[PDB]
Amino acid sequence: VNALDDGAMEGQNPLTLRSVFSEGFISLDKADITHPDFGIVFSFEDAEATLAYTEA
Amino acid sequence: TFTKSPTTTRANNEFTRYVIDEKVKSSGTNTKLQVRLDLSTENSFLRPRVRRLMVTTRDE
Amino acid sequence: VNALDDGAMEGQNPLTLRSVFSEGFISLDKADITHPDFGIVFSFEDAEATLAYTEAHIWGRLISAPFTEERTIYQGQASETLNVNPYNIPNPLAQSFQYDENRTISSLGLYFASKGDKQSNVVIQIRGMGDQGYPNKTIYAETVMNADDIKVSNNASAETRVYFDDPMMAEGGKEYAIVIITENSDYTMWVGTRTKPKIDKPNEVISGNPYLQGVLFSSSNASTWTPHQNSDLKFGIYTSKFNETATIEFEPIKLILDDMASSTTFDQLKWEPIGNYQDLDVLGLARQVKLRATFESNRYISPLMSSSDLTFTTFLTELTGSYVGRAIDMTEAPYNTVRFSYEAFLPKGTKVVPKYSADDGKTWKTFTKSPTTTRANNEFTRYVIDEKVKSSGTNTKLQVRLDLSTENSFLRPRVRRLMVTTRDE
Amino acid sequence: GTAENESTIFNKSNNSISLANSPVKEIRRVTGQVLIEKERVTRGAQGDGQDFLSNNTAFEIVKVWTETSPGVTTKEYKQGEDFRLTDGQTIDWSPQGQEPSGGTSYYVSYKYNKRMEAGKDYEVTTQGEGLSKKWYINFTPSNGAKPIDQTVVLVDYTYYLARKDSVFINKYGDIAILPGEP
Amino acid sequence: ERTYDESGSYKVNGFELFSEGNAEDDDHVSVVVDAGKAYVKGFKVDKPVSTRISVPKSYDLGTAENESTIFNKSNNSISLANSPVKEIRRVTGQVLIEKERVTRGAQGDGQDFLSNNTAFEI
Amino acid sequence: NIMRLVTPPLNTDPENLQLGTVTVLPDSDEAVCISFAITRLSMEDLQKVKTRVDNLEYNQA
Incomplete structure (x- = not known):
């Protein structure tokens, strides 16, 4: 913890x-x-x- | 991949706590560790979330 | 730990x-x-x-003071007036300082050029200084100053004195900022600025920096501060050195023969009138007994109680209060044994009763064992209790409590470094 | 004979209430709506969880709020978006709105039906004698919990029953009695 | 004596509990205890084969009284807090009677009895 | 007791060794069985505990 x-x-x-x-x-x-x-x-x-959003 | 099913405890309205405790190696001992989570969806709106990732290992 | x-x-x-x-x-x-x-x-x-003091008759004069003050820092040069809230006038400020040693700050000195109406008040605060030389959100001391307490003058002569209920312990080599906040847009303060003429001596000008180790600040929300390098407030910080004892005397005073026996039965070192009580009285059934009270002084005496004019009820108030942790x-970790450790400074007439609960504060239990004592420093002492709270079974909840209480206003307890650990044995 | 759910409106002007059947043996139960004010409740560790009230018969929440000093309301939670009443037992924080931090204490005010205790919440007396004798529930004690004003108070109690018998004589000269229905 | 005074009672291996539900009796639930070895009071207890045991079913009842809920005209359904309900002893609720026909008694300034004896407001 | 508040019986007899607990649901064939038997710790297991303590101490440093 x-x-x-x-x-x-x-x-x-x-x-x-x-x-x-x-x-x-x-x-990071x-x-x-x-x-x-x-x-x-x-x-x-x-x-x-x-x-996160991604195309294709 | 872990063979045991995780025991579940609710954290709040959204999140649920998943815990696995498995003897990964029947005999001998490992000497290297790398931790991973695979996340996935099947539509663009509804997505998973994770938080408070804790991993510990023991020699039993 | x-x-x-x-x-x-x-x-x-x-x-x-x-x-x-x-x-x-x-x-918190x-x-x-x-x-x-x-x-x-x-x-x-x-x-x-x-x-902290809570109010919930005759007057009394603090003869032997519990500490003597000395003005260590003093920036006396002033040239101009700055509004306490420049960036919101229709149509807060701060000033940094530091010491080279550990000093007990007891009071502050400020100079006000003008004030608001009777109902207005100014909040005075001491805040700490962050690593990048700016004021931080931590507040060490706070007080409210009414309009009548704020003296004013057209030549920066009037000095209003600010007292806090708890003394500010300034650590050597650490910076601290005074902070002045008020909602009223009719408050101004004298400021000294380099190369400007002095108010009382226009022939002379402020050649070097007013206060070299400090900077004047201004803000529109008490968060983002704009420094003024060439300017500093006109202020004065007093530090205190406590002495061995302190004495109070009360103005002279239900029938006197019954009364004096009844009174001196209660006025004793162990009841809530703590300290060496004395009196002198007059014969012929005269009504004028005169009381005295003497007590051991220490570094944690409240400056605000010392400066304020006392009464027999404001003094001899029995203060109470408790710390309660979440x-x-x-x-997931059941227990049946508890180790309770805490450091507590106990002047005469004070108590610190530890307590715990295993049911979300429905019921509060008390330890049976007596704590083992180890001396921390000249004031504080470490109290440790190790007791098997449950003889059989295991608890599943914990909530820590400490109960503080006083006999009089001046002498109060102080706790620090509270540590509680449980076991299953 | 058993009298159940004998209903009478409680008045704050007049605490006494009368029982219809005269020869009362024992009062089984007296229940009335009571308002608790400023009940301390501890927040449970689980977020969006449930915190159990001291009384399990609650049916309405009046006010939920926190205080750092007496009489100063730090925050008042709004019902129907911050919390709701669930099962008449728990303050459920499943609504989206704000909730106290886990482990912190807050106040609750709510109405519930309290089962009144004889000689604590009320005392029983009597005025007349014989058949005209009556039994009253006074709610005399000061600390005792009193019903909310202009609310119904239900009293269950038993009472004795009269019997009427017939006397007969047969040809053998044997006098006998047949018992009638109580 | 030596064993108990050194280490007390402890299990070596086995004695796992498993639920089977064998219908030997409708008022009991079968439980299996797996074979295993242990030292109890310093005496070895070696069991080669599992042992079957049965627990009696729980039929003790808890009573809930005066469970209150405000009725709403919009939503007629009201829920019960406790889940495994057995029977409902009583349901009571204020009801309004409209236009009840009553006969005036013979006695003047007398009393005429209502159909229901639990009334409280006229 | 209700399922939220039910607890196993409390016993302190030295002569008995507890193997576990069996919870029965209210009026149902289903039952939950859990083993809480005290089990030994061989010297290898205690040496592993000693090593875990050493790792804990090292992580603390």
């Missing part, structure tokens, strides 16, 4: 909590935005993620 | 730590301020909580 509110992660060789991963949906540090399947959008005010 | 420093909580369905609850007294999020018994006031500069849902 405490890790859910951190929303920060170092770029090169980050120190990470052992056996924990939590996403508060407040920062935890997210792997460059992954091919990454397609959600963030709503930082609600701390929520969802899908 | 880590949760003590969080000071944030969500309104709708908050994620709460299981079997943990702590209150750093830094934000953890407190049930709407509770009927909630009557405590926070002091965010010290991270402490205390009781109900915690321990369904």
Whole structure:
């Protein structure tokens, strides 16, 4: 729970909590935005993620 | 993909809490983790939402 | 201990730590301020909580004062008048300051050029200074000053004195801003501006900056502040140093022989008339007994009580009030043992009764064990209770409470660093 | 004989109310509409959830509001968009509108039918004697809960029944009695 | 004694509960307890095969009285709070009678009885 | 008691080991069965607990 509110992660060789991963949906540090399947959008005010509209 | 069905607890009028607790590996231990959620719709108006994602692992 | 420093909580369905609850007294999020018994006031500069004065006969003169004031900062140069609300006059302001050491601020000095009608009032506030050198929304002190209290003058000579119910503890090396707010568009204040002639001495001009370590600010909503680098207010901050004891004397005074025995039965060190009571009296069945009261002074004496003219009822008021924290849902973590830890400063004639509930405040229980004491500092002392609250079974709800009460107005308790943890044993 | 649902309008001018049948044995139940004012209620952790009133017979919500000091209304919630009455038991916050934060206490005012307790809410007395004797429900105690004004009060109670018998004599000279219907 | 004083009672394995609903009696629900091993009071309890047990059905009744609801002309349906309802003991409600024919008694300044004895307003 | 307020019986007899609880719905064949049996912890399990404590301490640092 405490890790859910951190929303920060170092770029090169980050120190990470052992056996924990939590996403508060407040920062792009935890997210792997460059992954091919990454397609959600963030709503930082609600701390929520969802899908945006796309054509075709 | 997890084989167990999630136990459900209601959070508010909209959101519902889904929790899975499964022994992913019968023998031995994993040493790498990457977490994922696949989101989908079948029309342009009604879309899902997620929040407060927490994953933890244990050696049992 | 880590949760003590969080000071944030969500309104709708908050994620709460299981079997943990702590209150750093830094934000209203953890407190049930709407509770009927909630009557405590926070002091965010010290991270402490205390009781504010509530009024609910003869006069009395505070002879031996409980502290002596000294004017450490004073910007005396003035040149011009600035409206307190420039950006809304038909057809707030602030001034930053800092100290190099830990000082106990007791009162403020301001200068007003003009004021409104009898009914108008001005709100005076001390707010903190954020990392980027601007005032923040946190408020450490607040008071309301009526029109009659605001003195005025055409040569910046009249000094109105502002007193707060709780003293402002200014930490060394930290900036703080005075903030002045009023809804009335007929309030003005003297300001000193560089290169402008002095009001009383037009031959002279303000050569250097008026106050170098401060800046004058202005705002149209008390949120976005426009600095005025070359200008500062004409103001004066007083700091206080408390002394060993303080004494009150009451004007001289149901038949005197019964009365004096009846009175001196009640006026004692342990009833709500706290402190070393004395008197002298006159013979021949004369009516004029004269009372005295002496008590031990400390750093947390209210300046506003010291400055105000006392009465036998405003003094000897027994203040009461309670902290009540938001109900915690321990369904997923049942417990039957509770460890209750809190630091409390208890002057003579004060009490701090811990309490808990396992039914959303329907019923309030009390611990049977006596707390083990560990001295924190010269004032505060750490009280810890570890008790198996339920002999068999497990509770599923938690709500923390602290009950504060005083014998008189001047001496009040203070609590800080409240930590409560539960277990299943 | 059993008398049920014996109805009489309660008047705030006159607390006493009379019972029709004279030889009363015991009053089974006295019920009347009562107004609770300023009932403290704690908000439940679940958002858009249900909070149970102290009395499960409630039928109307008057006012829901919060206070930080006595007599100062911080906010008044509007019924039908912020909350509704559900099952006459709970303040349901399923409507879209605003609601208090989870864990916070708020006040509630509501009307319910209270089952009056003998010697607490009312006291029973009598005036006459014999057949002309009457029984009254006074609602005398000050702290006792009184019915709302110009509302119906229902009283269930039992009473004794008279019997009339016939005397007979047969040819053998045996006097006997046949009991009649009570 | 040693076992209990060291570790107390504890389960080793098994003894899972399963509901089957076997119709041995309409007033009972069958439950199966799976085979398993445990140490109770320091004495081993090894069961090779599951054991069947039956619980009696719950028929105890809770009474709801004076359950109030404002009637509305627009919507005639009114709901009952408790779900598993068995029977409705009584339903009562204010009713207006219009144009009831009454015969004047022989006695002057007397009393004429109404058809219903629960009246409250004329 | 009503399903919202029903609870299992409270017992403190040392001679019995609790295996679980069986809830029966009001007037129905259906029943919910849950196992709450106290189970042992071997030395391997306690060593795993010790390791989890070490990881917790490390995450705290």
